[PDB]
Design an enzyme around this catalytic site. Structure first.
Site, PDB file in Angstrom:
ATOM      1  N   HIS A  76      -4.575  12.320  -8.458  1.00 12.64           N
ATOM      2  CA  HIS A  76      -5.354  13.261  -7.672  1.00 12.64           C
ATOM      3  C   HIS A  76      -4.747  13.405  -6.280  1.00 12.64           C
ATOM      4  CE1 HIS A  76      -8.590  15.392  -5.747  1.00 12.64           C
ATOM      5  NE2 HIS A  76      -8.967  14.337  -5.050  1.00 12.64           N
TER       6      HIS A  76
ATOM      7  N   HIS B 210      -5.841  14.198  -2.895  1.00  9.93           N
ATOM      8  CA  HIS B 210      -7.164  14.146  -2.279  1.00  9.93           C
ATOM      9  C   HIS B 210      -7.306  15.077  -1.079  1.00  9.93           C
ATOM     10  CE1 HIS B 210     -11.031  11.844  -1.245  1.00  9.93           C
ATOM     11  NE2 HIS B 210     -10.855  12.734  -0.284  1.00  9.93           N
TER      12      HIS B 210
ATOM     13  N   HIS C 178      -3.765   9.479  -5.177  1.00  7.63           N
ATOM     14  CA  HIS C 178      -4.085   8.241  -5.892  1.00  7.63           C
ATOM     15  C   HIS C 178      -4.330   8.494  -7.356  1.00  7.63           C
ATOM     16  CE1 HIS C 178      -8.443   9.213  -5.896  1.00  7.63           C
ATOM     17  NE2 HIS C 178      -8.201   9.663  -4.676  1.00  7.63           N
TER      18      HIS C 178
ATOM     19  N   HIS D 296      -6.351   8.824 -10.549  1.00  8.89           N
ATOM     20  CA  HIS D 296      -7.720   9.174 -10.795  1.00  8.89           C
ATOM     21  C   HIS D 296      -8.080   8.870 -12.246  1.00  8.89           C
ATOM     22  CE1 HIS D 296     -11.572  10.762  -9.878  1.00  8.89           C
ATOM     23  NE2 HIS D 296     -11.176  11.196  -8.695  1.00  8.89           N
TER      24      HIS D 296
ATOM     25  N   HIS E  27     -22.728   4.354   0.401  1.00 17.17           N
ATOM     26  CA  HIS E  27     -21.890   5.015  -0.598  1.00 17.17           C
ATOM     27  C   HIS E  27     -21.163   6.249  -0.031  1.00 17.17           C
ATOM     28  CE1 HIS E  27     -23.772   2.523  -3.610  1.00 17.17           C
ATOM     29  NE2 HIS E  27     -24.957   3.094  -3.479  1.00 17.17           N
TER      30      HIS E  27
ATOM     31  N   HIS F   9     -17.640  11.963  -2.439  1.00 21.31           N
ATOM     32  CA  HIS F   9     -16.514  12.891  -2.316  1.00 21.31           C
ATOM     33  C   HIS F   9     -16.720  14.091  -3.241  1.00 21.31           C
ATOM     34  CE1 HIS F   9     -12.643  14.700  -2.072  1.00 21.31           C
ATOM     35  NE2 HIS F   9     -12.185  14.200  -3.205  1.00 21.31           N
TER      36      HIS F   9
ATOM     37  N   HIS G 138     -14.674  17.263  -4.836  1.00 18.78           N
ATOM     38  CA  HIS G 138     -13.367  17.861  -5.082  1.00 18.78           C
ATOM     39  C   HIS G 138     -13.397  19.367  -4.854  1.00 18.78           C
ATOM     40  CE1 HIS G 138     -11.258  14.486  -7.365  1.00 18.78           C
ATOM     41  NE2 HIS G 138     -12.359  13.972  -6.849  1.00 18.78           N
TER      42      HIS G 138
ATOM     43  N   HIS H 108     -18.483  12.529  -6.769  1.00 11.56           N
ATOM     44  CA  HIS H 108     -18.688  11.119  -7.079  1.00 11.56           C
ATOM     45  C   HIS H 108     -18.612  10.190  -5.872  1.00 11.56           C
ATOM     46  CE1 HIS H 108     -14.464   9.809  -6.555  1.00 11.56           C
ATOM     47  NE2 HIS H 108     -14.167  11.024  -6.981  1.00 11.56           N
ATOM     48  N   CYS H 109     -19.152   8.993  -6.061  1.00 10.43           N
ATOM     49  CA  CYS H 109     -18.959   7.929  -5.091  1.00 10.43           C
ATOM     50  C   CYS H 109     -17.503   7.497  -5.154  1.00 10.43           C
ATOM     51  CB  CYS H 109     -19.865   6.751  -5.409  1.00 10.43           C
ATOM     52  SG  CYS H 109     -19.885   5.607  -4.035  1.00 10.43           S
ATOM     53  N   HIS H 110     -16.891   7.323  -3.991  1.00  8.56           N
ATOM     54  CA  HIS H 110     -15.467   7.030  -3.937  1.00  8.56           C
ATOM     55  C   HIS H 110     -15.187   5.530  -3.851  1.00  8.56           C
ATOM     56  CE1 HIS H 110     -11.232   7.853  -3.561  1.00  8.56           C
ATOM     57  NE2 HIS H 110     -11.428   9.159  -3.458  1.00  8.56           N
ATOM     58  N   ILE H 111     -16.240   4.713  -3.964  1.00  6.22           N
ATOM     59  CA  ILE H 111     -16.040   3.290  -4.230  1.00  6.22           C
ATOM     60  C   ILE H 111     -15.650   3.228  -5.715  1.00  6.22           C
ATOM     61  CG2 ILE H 111     -17.113   1.010  -4.463  1.00  6.22           C
ATOM     62  CD1 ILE H 111     -18.880   1.906  -1.909  1.00  6.22           C
TER      63      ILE H 111
ATOM     64  N   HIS I 297     -17.685   1.752  -8.487  1.00  8.24           N
ATOM     65  CA  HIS I 297     -18.932   2.489  -8.751  1.00  8.24           C
ATOM     66  C   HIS I 297     -18.666   3.737  -9.595  1.00  8.24           C
ATOM     67  CE1 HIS I 297     -20.873   0.648  -4.870  1.00  8.24           C
ATOM     68  NE2 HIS I 297     -20.388  -0.262  -5.697  1.00  8.24           N
TER      69      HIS I 297
ATOM     70  N   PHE J 190     -20.868   6.619 -11.540  1.00  7.27           N
ATOM     71  CA  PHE J 190     -21.521   7.216 -10.367  1.00  7.27           C
ATOM     72  C   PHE J 190     -20.874   8.546 -10.009  1.00  7.27           C
ATOM     73  CE2 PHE J 190     -23.809   5.655  -6.224  1.00  7.27           C
ATOM     74  CZ  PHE J 190     -24.948   6.379  -6.601  1.00  7.27           C
TER      75      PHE J 190
END
Ligand SMILES: *[C@@H]1O[C@H](CO)[C@@H](O[C@@H]2O[C@H](CO)[C@@H](O[C@@H]3O[C@H](CO)[C@@H](O)[C@H](O)[C@@H]3O)[C@H](O)[C@H]2NC(C)=O)[C@H](O)[C@H]1NC(C)=O
Ligand SMILES: *[C@@H]1O[C@H](CO)[C@@H](O[C@@H]2O[C@H](CO)[C@@H](O)[C@H](O)[C@H]2NC(C)=O)[C@H](O)[C@H]1NC(C)=O
Ligand SMILES: CC(=O)N[C@@H]1[C@@H](O)[C@H](O)[C@@H](CO)O[C@H]1O
Ligand SMILES: CC(=O)N[C@@H]1[C@@H](O)[C@H](O)[C@@H](CO)O[C@H]1O
Ligand SMILES: CC(=O)N[C@@H]1[C@@H](O)[C@H](O)[C@@H](CO)O[C@H]1O
Ligand SMILES: [Cu+2]
Ligand SMILES: [Cu+2]
Ligand SMILES: [Cu+2]
Ligand SMILES: [Cu+2]
Length: 499
Positions: free
Chosen positions: A64, A66, A109, A111, A395, A398, A400, A452-455, A458, A463
């Site tokens: 991805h 980002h 990164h 994905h 949290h 993000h 896209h 989504h949560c970018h942790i 998670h 998530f």
């Protein structure tokens, strides 16, 4: 450094960024990966060559880019089973996209699953020859990119489902863990008398970091790729996947100064030079700083950030004064996260492929209950009310394909419909504060876009949801290359142990 047209070769290799050797996923031999760069208007042709051999960290991959809108190239966005099937080992795949209307600080990164935590992440800068902030600094190059990362001694698939912090924080790819307090620290060099545009990139997979430099203040001029008015701060809390450009004036005495990036959990503080790097003025001796940290008296607050140029907030200045309002109700059961009752499980047929195959309604799109169909050319408002039902706050969510106005930030009860900052990753705050972080964007970009949560741990627990935007136009708008069409058959033909 590399690009806009380049090969990115993905391999497993031994690395020791904190002195502890461990197998990682690396890009052109290194983690974090090398800087990818270009200028606004460029066409990027990033050929990703999957030479991975280790099933535990995944032999397949997907990358991805980002923060990029990817208008008309949704197939290139990266999320596995949303925008493509993964690239298979022994194969390569060309990400071919343009950045006609964006400049600033980004990153790239994996994905696919939690593979980016294992090393597949790097910074990505798009320069602006007419940068409106150009008069504020003298130097902006490879050496002014500062990456932050959480580093773990145990691989993502081998440790706890939700790790309790990293072993080391890495700054420009180096840092100290408890296991070796003499490991090499990163050095960032500055010549006294020059102003530097530092592009701070969080490559983190979990924790946020409170970033500061001893004896120096910082002028924030960019927030996730959006130009901001100059905000003078003495510390920056930066969440996973966020970016800031700040100007540092190298106007202090020739000396060594501690650069600090303190995580929110794990090994906190600075004993033995953990969570640290070195700001070295040209001419200072090659030793560690002995500078002391001073209380932050002008920390960054997101509500203090405003776009450099007047940027209208989508919709009208009232709660729910938009074409479509969506509320995200969070749940968590110990292993999985849920958004409005659904834990995301990747579909066997990527969402984009489903759409190209005719699926245009929420009813027809899989997974059932995780896909939200959005009207075209419409204002959208999404609220993420913080709840103790979903542990792991704050949290960072993000979206896209878009930048959004942060109409209400964490720690604030204000709704700013006039001049709020726009960004792509936002902290959703804490339930203690009764936070209700709310965002707004316009549907100007046909395609399915991950939210989504970018942790990353998670995300892995589900998530996430899909925003399927302007589905009837998706096929016409994003014509797909043969190589993309070939990804799913190839991936589905793999022995599961080669995935
Ligand atoms: C595939 O990648 C994985 C994950 O990086 C590698 O897993 C590694 O597996 C070994 C066990 O074979 C683990 O070794 C343990 O190492 C620690 C630390 O050195 C040592 O104290 C223990 O006695 C034991 O040897 C290792 O922790 C683990 N790596 C990680 C990062 O979790 C696996 O080795 C890779 N396969 C190949 C062929 O390289
Ligand atoms: C960075 O910004 C801080 C905060 O404005 C500056 O701290 C003032 O510093 C002066 C001179 O040392 C003192 O009179 C004030 O009491 C400080 N204000 C506060 C609220 O702490 C600091 O001087 C700046 N540092 C640099 C190197 O520019
Ligand atoms: C997007 C969303 O859920 N909006 C809600 C709406 O349904 C409700 O009427 C109101 C009062 O609680 O709060 C807001
Ligand atoms: C700890 C726990 O109860 N885990 C469950 C898991 O078994 C199940 O697969 C998932 C379905 O969404 O919900 C969660
Ligand atoms: C806990 C909380 O305040 N939740 C609110 C919710 O009631 C409202 O529907 C939504 C849209 O305004 O914002 C959020
Ligand atoms: Cu990202
Ligand atoms: Cu993204
Ligand atoms: Cu999360
Ligand atoms: Cu994502």
């Amino acid at each position: 450094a590399v690009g806009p047209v380049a090969d990115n070769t993905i391999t497993d290799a031994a690395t020791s960024p904190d002195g502890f050797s461990r197998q990682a996923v690396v890009v052109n031999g290194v983690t974090p990966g090398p800087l990818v760069a270009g200028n606004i208007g460029d066409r990027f042709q990033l050929n990703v060559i999957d030479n991975l051999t280790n099933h535990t960290m995944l032999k397949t991959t997907s990358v991805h880019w980002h923060g990029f809108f990817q208008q008309g190239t949704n197939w290139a966005d990266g999320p596995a089973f949303i925008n493509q099937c993964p690239i298979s080992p022994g194969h390569s795949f060309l990400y071919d996209f343009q950045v006609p209307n964006q400049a600033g600080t980004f990153w790239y990164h994996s994905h696919l699953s939690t593979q980016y935590c294992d090393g597949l992440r790097g910074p990505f800068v798009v320069y602006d020859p007419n940068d409106p902030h150009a008069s504020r600094y003298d130097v902006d190059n490879d050496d002014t990119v500062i990456t932050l990362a959480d580093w773990y001694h145990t691989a993502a698939k081998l440790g706890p489902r939700f790790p309790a912090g990293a072993d080391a924080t890495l700054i420009n790819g180096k840092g100290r863990a408890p296991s070796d307090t003499s490991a090499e620290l990163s050095v960032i060099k500055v010549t006294k008398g020059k102003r530097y545009r530092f592009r701070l990139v969080s490559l983190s997979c979990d924790p946020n970091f409170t970033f500061s430099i001893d004896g120096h203040n910082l002028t924030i001029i960019e927030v996730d790729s959006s130009n901001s008015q100059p905000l003078s701060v003495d510390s920056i809390q930066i969440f996973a996947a966020q970016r800031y450009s700040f100007v540092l004036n190298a106007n202090q005495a020739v000396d060594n100064y501690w650069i600090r990036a303190n995580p929110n959990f794990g090994n906190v503080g600075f004993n033995g030079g953990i969570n640290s790097a070195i700001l070295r003025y040209d001419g200072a001796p090659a030793v560690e700083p002995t500078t002391n940290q001073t209380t932050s008296v002008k920390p960054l607050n997101e509500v203090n950030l405003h776009p450099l140029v007047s940027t209208p907030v989508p919709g009208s200045p009232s709660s729910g004064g938009v074409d479509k309002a969506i509320n995200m109700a969070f749940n968590f059961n110990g292993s999985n996260f849920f958004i409005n009752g659904a834990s995301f499980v990747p579909p066997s047929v990527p969402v984009l492929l489903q759409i190209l195959s005719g699926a245009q309604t929420a009813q027809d799109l899989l997974p059932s209950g995780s896909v939200y169909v959005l009207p075209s050319n419409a204002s959208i408002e999404i609220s993420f009310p913080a709840t103790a039902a979903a542990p792991g706050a704050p949290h960072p969510f993000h979206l896209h394909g878009h930048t959004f106005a942060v109409v209400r930030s964490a720690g604030s009860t204000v709704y700013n419909y006039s001049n709020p900052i726009f960004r792509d990753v936002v902290s959703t705050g804490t339930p203690a504060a009764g936070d209700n972080v709310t965002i707004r964007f316009l549907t100007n970009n046909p395609g399915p876009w991950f939210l989504h949560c970018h942790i990353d741990f998670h995300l892995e627990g589900g998530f996430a949801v899909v925003q399927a935007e302007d589905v009837p136009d998706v096929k016409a708008t994003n014509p797909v290359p043969q190589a993309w069409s070939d990804l799913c058959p190839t991936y589905d033909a793999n022995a599961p142990s080669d995935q």
